[PDB]
Curated annotation (Swiss-Prot), chain A:
Assembly: Interacts with NUP214/CAN. Interacts with NUP62 and NUP98.
UniProt note on tissues of expression: Ubiquitous.
Disease: Fetal akinesia deformation sequence 4: A clinically and genetically heterogeneous group of disorders with congenital malformations related to impaired fetal movement. Clinical features include fetal akinesia, intrauterine growth retardation, polyhydramnios, arthrogryposis, pulmonary hypoplasia, craniofacial abnormalities, and cryptorchidism. FADS4 inheritance is autosomal recessive.
Function: Component of nuclear pore complex.
Organism name: Homo sapiens
UniProt-recorded name of the protein: Nuclear pore complex protein Nup88
Lineage: superkingdom: Eukaryota
Signal peptide (from-to): none
Cellular compartment(s): Nucleus, Nuclear pore complex
UniProtKB/Swiss-Prot annotation, chain B:
GO molecular function per UniProt: structural constituent of nuclear pore
Distribution of this protein across tissues and organs: Expressed in the testis.
UniProt function note: Plays a role in the nuclear pore complex (NPC) assembly and/or maintenance. May anchor NUP62 and other nucleoporins, but not NUP153 and TPR, to the NPC. In association with TMEM209, may be involved in nuclear transport of various nuclear proteins in addition to MYC.
Designated name of the protein: Nuclear pore complex protein Nup205
Disease with which this protein is associated in UniProt: Nephrotic syndrome 13: A form of nephrotic syndrome, a renal disease clinically characterized by severe proteinuria, resulting in complications such as hypoalbuminemia, hyperlipidemia and edema. Kidney biopsies show non-specific histologic changes such as focal segmental glomerulosclerosis and diffuse mesangial proliferation. Some affected individuals have an inherited steroid-resistant form and progress to end-stage renal failure.
Key word Phosphoprotein present: yes
One term under GO cellular component: nuclear membrane
GO biological process: mRNA transport; nuclear pore complex assembly; nuclear pore organization; nucleocytoplasmic transport; protein transport
Positions spanned in the full protein: 1566 to 2012 of 2012
Phosphoserine carried by residues: S374, S377
Assembly behavior: Part of the nuclear pore complex (NPC). Forms a complex with NUP35, NUP93, NUP155 and lamin B. Does not interact with TPR. Interacts with TMEM209 and MYC.
Family in the record: Belongs to the NUP186/NUP192/NUP205 family.
From Swiss-Prot, chain C:
Residues passing through the membrane, by range: none
Subunit description: Part of the nuclear pore complex (NPC). Component of the p62 complex, a complex composed of NUP62 and NUP54. Forms a complex with NUP35, NUP155, NUP205 and lamin B; the interaction with NUP35 is direct. Does not interact with TPR. Interacts with SMAD4 and IPO7; translocates SMAD4 to the nucleus through the NPC upon BMP7 stimulation resulting in activation of SMAD4 signaling. (Microbial infection) Interacts with SARS-CoV translation inhibitor nsp1; this interaction may disrupt nuclear pore function.
Disulphide-bonded residues: none
Signal peptide stretch: none
High-level lineage: Eukaryota, Metazoa, Chordata, Craniata, Vertebrata
Entry's family note: Belongs to the nucleoporin interacting component (NIC) family.
This protein's name: Nuclear pore complex protein Nup93
Swiss-Prot record, chain D:
Positions of the Peptidase S59 domain: 8-150
Modified positions (Phosphoserine) in chain numbering: S109
UniProt lineage: Eukaryota, Metazoa, Chordata, Craniata, Vertebrata
Domain of life, per lineage: Eukaryota
Effect of substituting K78A: No effect on autoprocessing. Severe loss of autoprocessing
Protein name, entry field: Nuclear pore complex protein Nup98
Disulfide bonds: none
Length: 148, 447, 48, 150
């Protein structure tokens, strides 16, 4: 994220890869992640939402409000992050996913995913699109709480 | 000047302060900036300290109007309460502010010392003007947000994490610790004093009859019992500031101020001895005392100028430590008053909720009836329905833990303090009188 | 000379205002504390 | 003997480092026909023909992760094509399985890996890389391919 006030320095930076604790090694494997579709391709914003209260420690009361950014990979996996430019970066911006697509699909819903669109409705409707010309209509719903 | 405060309330100064939008323009203090550089002391203050140079004079003016305009001008408290409500989410942002800088503690120390005088119940019954029920319910809804957030400061600063907050500062920045530590210790004890002033004034206004006293602290003393065991830093779930504190915080704060007092007494006495012998101090102590007033250039000024700066630091330390002794004295006496009134309620006037004969007193009003007609009865919104369900086990446990937690090694220290300090006030034996009454209640077995 | 005998006058003007303001603002906390302690210095005798 | 360094956890060679220590000549010159390197349960790299290994740090020069395999990973330290390890190779990465988009597990049925045409996808992006695909093995998740250089 860049500011037009400060157009050479990012206001915020979000890494999309799980790559903690293995440091001090160089850059080359960018050929092989792409063959598996492990490249982020596209993103879109849903409407302004109140953040799930489990994502903060049990200190707060004010309901924090942020934009849900939906992010698509070249393999057709989808991820979520909650982005605010009005609040401190305590847990705000954590990546959430991969988001499970129901029902399950025996092709795995393609591997040539190229575009995404998040419609301004409740619940959200996320359109996912492929280079093969397939368009999937994903309704977004909050997950289930498991009994013991 | 009392006349000047009245003439400022007639010119409408608080109504003008309640029109200024600069107080809500609070700069965002980014926590990630702590890894960015070592900037020199620039001739232009930070946006946050410019915001403090704007806000702190307004809070001090409001606080001073509430301290020259003595207890006959409910209009002064009502105007300052309206100013706390125009800026109400900024006032809540200060009361939530997790920073422990000398500035955030001065913001909190002034604000609590305004709320202690402006957020009092009788002010709502004597503001006789055409205020719509909705705006009076929102006014109560703001007071009932400030009250709960101020009670949440007693667990933060009058509780066991004050002894974490100092460590996180004592580790990080060597060259400037001493100068600011006097002011952080002072402002923490002002926050504790002003919330205890508020709790006392509420427990004096809320009923002339002892049977109807407003309890502010739950009968839980467990906050005083659970610490003789070293175990690892699992995050303590920080206590939702909708929850009322335990009475254990009052006994812990009473135990803490009855240790801090002796430390501040010998610190004051050592500082007075250093002020009497300044020209016999080591040149390096004279240099530290000077550096705490002039962070640069001390090796260019004269020996007379160094002794004058050392004398000026020592006077500020003496007066800060005298201020601290007077605050620890107030917190001790007001802890004993609040502890007396809560034990007097819970042991004599409180009925346990396990008493089954109550079963006929509830089932008829929450069923839908529409439209009219006509007027004339009091819609008292019963706040008592937010009290905890007190079992007889909470009352047995309260009496057992209160006997242990108020044991004779504390009762002696409180009389040792009265024998040192209260020879300088018109009210010798007040600590003995409350220590006698609490020792009385704790000998009444319920039968 | 005139840069020096200007700057120490801008400094001296600011300094004369600074101790007025900061003695009045320090006296604001102290005037709350003595008033808190003196209204308290009515209450414990209404009690006693 | 031959100045070779290898210490990073889970790596190995064929011949073993103790055998590379026997085929080092009296001068310190070490040359190996059909040399292999790998990381256990992640993958391996095989060099068809004669390789000189003298004074190479393999802990800097060769990396194998889950789903990454590469050589001379600062290109300012890459030698000419044919020299050291910057040359033709056959390569395997193991546990190359796709995610199931609903259960979020890795797919491990040979059947369900034919149904998604996983092998045709691995050849199609071998072809986008300019690499020669060779074989897939669903049971190990092994993708095998040849490359000309790094």
């Amino acid at each position: 994220i860049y500011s037009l006030r400060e157009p050479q320095t990012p206001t915020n930076v979000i890494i999309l890869s799980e790559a903690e604790e293995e440091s001090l090694v160089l850059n080359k494997g960018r050929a092989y992640t792409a063959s598996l579709g492990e490249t982020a391709v596209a993103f879109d914003f849903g409407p302004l939402a109140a953040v799930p209260k489990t994502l903060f420690g049990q200190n707060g009361k004010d309901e924090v409000v942020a934009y849900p950014l939906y992010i698509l990979y070249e393999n057709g996996e989808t991820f979520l992050t909650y982005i605010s430019l009005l609040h401190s970066p305590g847990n705000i911006g954590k990546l959430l996913g991969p988001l499970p697509m129901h029902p399950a699909a025996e092709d795995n819903y393609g591997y040539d995913a190229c575009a995404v669109l998040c419609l301004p409705c409740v619940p959200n409707i996320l359109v996912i699109a492929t280079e093969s010309g397939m368009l999937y209509h994903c309704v977004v719903l909050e997950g289930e709480e498991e009994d013991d | 000047i009392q006349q000047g405060a009245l003439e400022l309330l007639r010119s409408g100064v608080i109504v003008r302060l309640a029109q200024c939008q600069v107080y809500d323009m609070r700069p965002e203090t980014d926590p990630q900036s702590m890894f960015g550089m070592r900037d020199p002391p620039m001739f232009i203050p930070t946006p946050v300290d410019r915001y403090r140079q704007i806000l702190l004079p307004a809070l001090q003016l409001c606080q001073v109007i509430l301290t020259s305009s003595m207890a006959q001008h409910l209009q002064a408290a009502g105007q300052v309460l309206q100013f706390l409500i125009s800026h109400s989410d900024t006032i809540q942002a200060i009361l939530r502010c997790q920073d422990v800088s000398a500035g955030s503690l001065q913001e909190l120390a002034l604000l609590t010392g305004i709320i202690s005088k402006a957020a009092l119940p009788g002010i709502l019954s004597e503001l006789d003007v055409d205020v719509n029920e909705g705006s009076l319910m929102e006014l109560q809804g703001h007071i009932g947000r400030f009250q709960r957030q101020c009670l949440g400061l007693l667990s933060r600063f009058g509780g066991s994490d004050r002894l974490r907050q100092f460590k996180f500062q004592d580790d990080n920045v060597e060259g400037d610790k001493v100068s600011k530590k006097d002011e952080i210790e002072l402002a923490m004890q002002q926050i504790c004093a002003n919330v205890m002033e508020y709790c006392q004034s509420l427990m004096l206004q809320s009923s002339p009859t002892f049977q109807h006293a407003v309890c502010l602290f739950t009968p839980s003393l467990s906050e005083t019992v659970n610490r003789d065991g070293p175990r690892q830093d699992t995050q303590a779930p920080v206590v939702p500031y909708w929850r009322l504190p335990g009475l254990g915080i009052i006994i812990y704060l009473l135990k803490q101020s009855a240790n801090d007092f002796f430390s501040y007494y010998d610190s004051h006495r050592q500082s007075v001895s250093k002020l009497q012998n300044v020209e016999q101090l080591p040149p390096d102590e004279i240099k530290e005392l000077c550096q705490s007033v002039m962070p640069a250039g001390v090796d260019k000024i004269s020996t007379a100028q160094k002794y004058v700066l050392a004398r000026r630091r020592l006077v500020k330390v003496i007066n800060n430590r005298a201020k601290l002794l007077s605050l620890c004295s107030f917190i001790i006496e007001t802890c004993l008053f609040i502890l007396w009134r809560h034990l007097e309620y819970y042991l004599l006037h409180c009925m346990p909720t396990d008493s089954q004969d109550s079963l006929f007193a509830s089932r008829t009003l929450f069923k839908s009836r529409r439209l009219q007609d006509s007027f004339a009865s009091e819609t008292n919104l019963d706040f008592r329905s937010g009290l905890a369900i007190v079992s007889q086990h909470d009352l047995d446990q309260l009496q057992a833990d209160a006997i242990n937690a108020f044991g004779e090694s504390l009762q002696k220290k409180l009389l040792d303090i009265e024998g040192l300090y209260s020879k300088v006030r018109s009210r010798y034996s007040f600590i003995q009188a409350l220590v006698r009454r609490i020792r009385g209640l704790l000998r009444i077995s319920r039968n | 000379i005139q840069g020096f005998l200007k700057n120490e006058k801008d400094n001296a003007l600011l300094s004369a205002i600074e101790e007025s303001r900061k003695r009045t603002f320090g006296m604001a906390e102290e005037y709350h504390r003595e008033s808190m302690l003196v209204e308290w210095e009515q209450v414990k005798q209404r009690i006693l | 003997p031959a100045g070779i360094i290898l210490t990073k956890v889970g790596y190995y060679t064929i011949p073993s480092m103790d055998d590379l220590a026997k085929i080092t000549n009296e001068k310190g010159e070490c040359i190996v026909s059909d040399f292999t390197i790998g990381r256990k349960g992640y993958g391996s790299i095989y060099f068809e023909g004669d390789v000189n290994l003298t004074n190479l740090n393999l802990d800097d020069i060769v990396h194998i992760r889950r789903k990454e395999v590469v050589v001379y990973l600062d290109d300012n330290q890459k030698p000419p094509v044919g020299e050291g390890l910057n040359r033709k190779a056959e390569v395997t990465l193991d546990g190359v399985w796709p995610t199931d988009k609903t259960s979020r597990c890795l797919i491990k049925s040979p059947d369900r890996l034919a149904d998604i045409n996983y092998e045709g996808r691995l050849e199609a992006v071998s072809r986008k890389q300019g690499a020669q695909f060779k074989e897939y093995r669903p049971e190990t998740g092994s993708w095998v391919f040849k490359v000309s250089h790094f």
